[PDB]
Design a binder for this molecule. Structure first.
Ligand SMILES: *[C@@H]1O[C@H](CO)[C@@H](O)[C@H](O)[C@H]1NC(C)=O
Lengths: 48, 49
């Protein structure tokens, strides 16, 4: 019986816009879309 | 005409340990998945974002 999976901590800016200030700025125009993803990944780690 | 690799800068994560601010104000910091002999020289170079 499996008990847990590998815990992941993907990051919005580093994954999407690697060290690009303009790209990060245009990501900020998307609102808090990805803070949800960070919170959900923290959650999945916590449940593991 | 030689071969050179390419590596991540230092990509990692920062987690902050703290008791309730109603209890104290001291903090201790984490640096996720990075040998921090590398950040110890990094703070000396002040290259830490
Ligand atoms: C990470 O740990 C120490 C401290 O830096 C050193 O042996 C070396 O940098 C790394 N060791 C391994 C086994 O990756």
């Amino acid at each position: 019986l499996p008990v847990s999976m590998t815990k992941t901590s993907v990051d919005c800016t580093m994954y999407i816009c690697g060290d690009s200030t303009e790209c990060s700025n245009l990501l900020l125009q998307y609102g808090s879309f990805c803070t949800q993803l960070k919170r959900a990944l923290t959650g999945i780690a916590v449940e593991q | 005409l030689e071969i050179l690799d390419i590596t991540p800068c230092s990509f990692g994560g920062v987690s902050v340990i703290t008791p309730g601010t109603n209890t104290s104000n001291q903090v201790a910091v984490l640096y996720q998945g990075v040998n921090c002999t590398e950040v110890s020289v990094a703070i000396h170079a002040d290259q830490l974002t």
